[PDB]
Symmetry: D3
Subunit: 291 residues, 6 copies
């Protein structure tokens, strides 16, 4: 990159300024999962980007998943699962494993990566300081909605305590587990939790790292890839997408409808995808806004 | 307890006042382990006592162990251990399990118990916000000191950030894991970590919950049980005690020598042992002070 | 009290916690008079209880009477009184004596008692920092309302300045004298002033120390003693009580109707009646709530 | 005063500015007694001057006496005094009367006068919030020092709490009574207490209102009246003055030696003597400074 | 002034107190121009008066003109003017000169004068910290409104940032230049700008220094000079006054109608006219209030 | 710049992070003059860079020159100069012109440029709020030191008030004029003033924009251009450089010796030279550090 003329290094940084101004002092919630979480080089770049935002006076809040890691640990423990539809039943035993993997394994890796750049990251679940509660959710299995154990949606968020934590300069690394109104901890889909945290905290942007270039209207058609879309159009479009895109898309709608100015589905396989999406116009993601 | 005359209910509470004054606004560090951690009734009482202190404007900091739980999980995972002397070697794999059990299992139970009384508890390790570092320790096996993996002592403590967390009204629940100066996370003996946190934070008292009535000079002699002792006497006495008492005792010396006004070894099998030790003169523990 | 098993000392303190939580950070106004003011042992216990509340992060505000002491001083001064009905006329001369006895004698004893436990108590009248004003009141003498000099009801309260004084950690000891809108100081019935301070400051509880076990519906019938009653019932009941109970009762109605969650008439002849009423369910008082 | 040309009204106020700057933000302690306390017109002017200072962002602290008023009340109460030398013995009974007269009578008049201009004045004794303690003093009766009861000198001052009270915008009206180290309240000479408060609070000036034009070297010689004098000269001069001037002079030395930049003995029979001494060069007082 | 008896120096200062109370903590905006700006003795007195206000905890904000100085500099620069009606066209070149004279010459003199008394004065234009914007204004030339270049009225004021600057203790010296919504700086009539700043900042008073004794109803009739007048009367009166009085009068109406309690037209040729108008009843100015 | 692959736009921004961390929360003083001040494109880029720093939570302080502009205005005014050596004598008349050009012309352009990005820039001289004083300096003319009027060096800096201004979020644009100890304003060489402000405010870096690539040891030898040098080496080197480099170099020594970690001489003819020097390793400047 040193064969690059210095006058063009200058212009790339200069073109970041319109977005430094837009995001100064603001909350950006990032859903982090996928190849950006499993590959070492993408990992270290993601953590450096959180340090970047932080050293610009931007306020990142990281919400992370970890589905495949939970599965692996359940297999290592010989815990036989029950499956309704394509869904595993979250028994009390499965939750304990989920919680212990999400918070005591996956969240730890990111906290330590980020913290290589300074005392920024702090891990939390909705259990800590009663930061958020959960409400048990049911699922639709081929027509009928059904119960699959201690799985839920974010219920209420302690908006005030969360933003105190962020104003104190900390990067909250969130593992999506929270107690219900009776104190029974549920596991929450990390995508939908990111959308709820973003809306609760008045985030300026929601970033959803995904293992795809962006939203395709008519996948596989390469020409069908869109760069920006409104909630109304995207809602009518949603019952048409690959099984894996539904949660990422539903998050963007819930968030953007809920007042978050924009939600972005960006390519987590691109090194420093966060910096390219936020500080560059050459991003590959797709931006969702209200309409 | 209602057959108890009201005029004596009155006097018991009145006699708590000399200790409410002594402890008002102050930090009390509690090592929590043993039967007080495994039994349901003692569990709920311990958490209620932390809520009590907190609702008196006293500042508890909880440091917890969990040795037997780590062993069990290693056995459930089929992870064969190596043993030098009576010590298990903490490989990278054993640390990941320890960290995931301490922080993602044991600490969670206490956070949720305490938090049944309000938004108080918050879990943390030395990894979060760089709260404390670790230095690799060696051990003495029948004469010679040896290496047993990623096990260490608390190195430095972020005293300022810790007391901000406490002034914000939070009860820090600490899992004893922290990175070394190179970012490699070590597991720390929970007893010695409690002594280091107490001294770093200028605690007024160190409470060490133990499965015994108190320190015996000449165990089994029931008459040999002492109520208070100075560091000088207790140091010359230390090479004489049951294997299990050494860590609890070494903690009290390191702390009290380090300026903590008193450290107490109290009976964790007594319901509300924290309240009896702090707000009553009828305690069963033994108090260590400087001399 | 040492013959009392330690496990029951433990449970008495544990049962205080539901009320420590309820009252944490809150204002409790206490009317203090009667035998609790004249007997040495009750005196010292009352002051220790104010220190207790304070060392729990509860905010006591003490309003005191002193009728019999004013009478005595007037007799020592040879000041002949005029009496309309059963009421002494408060001339300018009688007010000066009242003010000087209430603020310069009675309030001083309590300030010095409380302050034996720390720098808490501070004496004040509505004159200081313009904390509250008075409005001249008339009285009903056998049918007709009449003028009995410079006696009044609390008019307006400097709510903000009062709670600053309390947030600064001080226990306000209030002598019920205040200027009217023209600067002429009036004496205020201490019971009704306690009710006005409690309502103005958003107190959580009003405690009225009285020389009786509690409110009797049909005094002398011992069985007629009630433990809790609503304002509607008690209002229809009020024109039936002993002459001395009317002021204590009228205070509870004015306060509870005014939004104070509960007002209590408690036995001031019981040592530490404040602690038993607030931190115990075995209290002898009667609780008034809205309805 | 309206026959006075407007251009000279202008210049008088303009010439106040060098002293407005000198005193801005600073503490001025005023001993108030004598004819300035007993005459109605001087009274109202003194209180207006305290309001003046306050509305300039200057911080007055008023310390008041009241000897003759105590005597009168003792006579009205038929309390026979004991006299060693020319000194009355302060029995427990005499103290109660002194305290009740100073704090519940004399201090009240000034609080209400000052407070006619706003919520400024607040009465206090060393008893309140433990603001200051007293140490029992003995006296010299024709050669030998002797005990005359509960009379003392200011021992320690809660400098911090006092200046918080002043930074909150309040004019402390101080009655000179305070507890000793055992809680027994003593009465303190108001002149010497003013000197101790001034020095403790880092006052810029000490004003001592007196019923005289100023210090005379060789009273009655009218020419012997001095305008300024150093502590060294005045100390060698002190054993030569009228009985009444000794306390006012000893106060100025203790204060000025103690670091107060200047202490002034000013004519309390001059209306608005405070304003003329502070904001004018035409003052009649005598200024004491270090040397 | 020393031949003046001290008891009358006392009374002049005492009579300032009703206005010290009225103005304590408040904003007073002063338009400064005319002979009070050009004469050395009036200059130094004006600056001392701003220091006076400041050392009373009053908040002056100074808005200054400088028309004749701009003319002179344009003549020294040989810049030929264009005149529509009696108005000079403010070309880009004339603005640069105006800005450079107002801010870099006239404002500097006052900042340095005021600052001889302390670190108070600070110069600013609407350009600094975006304190205020301008909107291009047109003028009426014998019937028709016309364009005379980059001249405008104050558009919006950064009320918050301005009062932060004043709460920090600074005396803002304002040169009336500000950018329009496109960033093009305009020059603003200093009289109308004073009226807009006073209203924006919630000023208690607007002072307009003028080279006249006050408003005359029927100039030259000496008897026609009025001391106070309401906005309704003065508005119907405005189309009758000397050309020079219109701007000063229009300012007072815009301000007083806009909620400023009073605006004063005072004689800037009187030394310390600010002190006589604010702290004396003998002022020569005329007070405008709402009606 | 869009033909540039997105993965290299990503890496350029990522490589800025080590310097974002180094400079976070810190003061950077920039001397601004030369072609970077006169050319429109460099102008707008410099102001955007100050906005950049500011939107990263870095604290720029801009010190500007303007020598050639003063000369031009003196010529436009027909003010004949006196010259001792190669130095113009700064008469009172020349200072007024300098001050009016520096503060009322040159500083205004930069304030308005910067402020196009937000309410950041604020102009000031040492006159405002007494921010800094000047001490008259003499100069060396062919051997002998001589007087050339009201020209000086920065004497003392109000470090506290300056950093309050910066903590409030403002970019101070400094025109180098300040009063001496008698209030007579002097003009200060802008290079030496930048060095004094940087050292006074504890700046992390001093940037000196210059119309050259960097320091040449043996100019014209292109190979003699150095990238970094210590103060000791550079001091022995100083009496060898082109007349124009002496002031820029003397500034770097005074600053770096005074504790500023590094001072940089950077090419002001390079667009966004500030961003390339601070956030890139490809800079053309030369870095001075202590040794
Ligand atoms: C280390 C730290 O500040 C925290 C770690 N977890 C937290 C939860 C709520 C508030 C603060 C924290
Ligand atoms: C010693 C003290 O703080 C006070 C004593 N009396 C007061 C009245 C209002 C506010 C404060 C006080
Ligand atoms: C020296 C100072 O505080 C200021 C000088 N100009 C300013 C403009 C806005 C806020 C502050 C200032």
């Amino acid at each position: 990159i040193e064969a690059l003329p210095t006058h063009i290094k200058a212009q790339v940084l200069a073109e970041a300024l319109p977005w430094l101004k837009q995001l100064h002092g603001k909350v950006v919630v990032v859903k982090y999962g996928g190849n950006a979480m499993t590959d070492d080089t993408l990992r270290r770049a993601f953590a450096a980007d959180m340090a970047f935002l932080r050293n610009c006076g931007i306020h990142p809040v990281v919400v992370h998943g970890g589905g495949p890691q939970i599965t692996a640990m359940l297999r290592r423990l010989g815990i036989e699962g029950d499956f309704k539809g394509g869904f595993r039943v979250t028994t009390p035993e499965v939750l304990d494993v989920a919680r212990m993997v999400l918070f005591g394994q996956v969240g730890r890796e990111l906290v330590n990566l980020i913290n290589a750049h300074g005392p920024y990251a702090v891990g939390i679940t909705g259990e800590d300081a009663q930061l958020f509660t959960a409400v048990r959710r049911s699922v639709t299995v081929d027509g009928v909605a059904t119960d699959i154990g201690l799985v839920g949606d974010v219920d209420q968020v302690n908006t005030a305590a969360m933003l105190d934590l962020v104003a104190a300069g900390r990067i909250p690394v969130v593992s999506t587990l929270a107690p219900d109104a009776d104190g029974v901890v549920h596991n929450i889909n990390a995508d939908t939790a990111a959308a709820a945290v973003a809306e609760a905290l008045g985030a300026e942007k929601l970033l959803m790292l995904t293992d795809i270039d962006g939203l395709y209207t008519r996948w596989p058609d390469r020409d069908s890839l869109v760069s920006e879309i409104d909630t109304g159009t995207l809602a009518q479009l949603l019952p048409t997408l690959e099984s894996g895109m539904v949660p990422k898309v539903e998050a963007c709608l819930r968030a953007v409808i809920g007042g978050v100015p924009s939600a972005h589905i960006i390519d987590g396989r691109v090194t420093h995808c966060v910096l390219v999406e936020l500080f560059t116009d050459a991003g590959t993601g797709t931006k969702v806004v209200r309409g």
